[PDB]
Amino acid sequence: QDAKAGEAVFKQCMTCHRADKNMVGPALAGVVGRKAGTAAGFTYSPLNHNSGEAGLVWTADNIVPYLADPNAFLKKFLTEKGKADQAVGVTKMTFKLANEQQRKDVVAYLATLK
Ligand code: HEC
Numbered sequence: 001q002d003a004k005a006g007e008a009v010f011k012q013c014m015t016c017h018r019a020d021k022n023m024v025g026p027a028l029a030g031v032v033g034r035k036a037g038t039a040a041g042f043t044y045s046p047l048n049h050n051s052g053e054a055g056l057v058w059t060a061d062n063i064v065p066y067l068a069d070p071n072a073f074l075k076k077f078l079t080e081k082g083k084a085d086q087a088v089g090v091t092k093m094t095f096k097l098a099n100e101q102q103r104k105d106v107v108a109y110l111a112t113l114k
């Protein structure tokens with residue numbers, strides 16, 4: 001949860017994301033503490049959208065595991081809500097970051113965007 005170390009990790013994330021505009025992925029400023037799937041202007045996959053509508057909020061403790069396996073995390077979330085029938089299919093332009101500390105750190109960095 002070292003935000004400054006997270007800035008470096010975020011350079012990897014900038015392959016697809018920016019803070020303040022949509023790109024391959026949605027803009028991330030304000031993502032921490034927000035309902036999943038609700039960055040203005042971005043067209044989410046059914047899986048990323050459906051998870052937010054089922055009550056997924058991007059708290060730090062949700063973003064950190066998500067970043068290791070977006071499809072698995074989202075499906076697990078929906079399945080535990082008894083909504084496995086909304087979890088069919090996969091996310092867009094899927095990226096996985098295995099390193100746990102890098103995930104923790106970049107999530108602290110995301111909180112600095114707003
Ligand atoms: C392109 C290959 C990506 C890289 C590298 C990273 N992300 Fe990403 N992210 C990408 C897309 C296309 C999407 C939307 C997927 C969909 O199916 O709609 C996302 C989504 C996120 C989210 C969820 C945002 C929301 O508003 O619900 C988060 C929190 C996120 N991405 C963060 C993130 C970070 C911190 C990354 C670097 C470690 C990163 N992503 C890389 C595409 C890509």
Ligand SMILES: [N]
Pocket residue numbers: 025070095
């Ligand atoms: N992502």
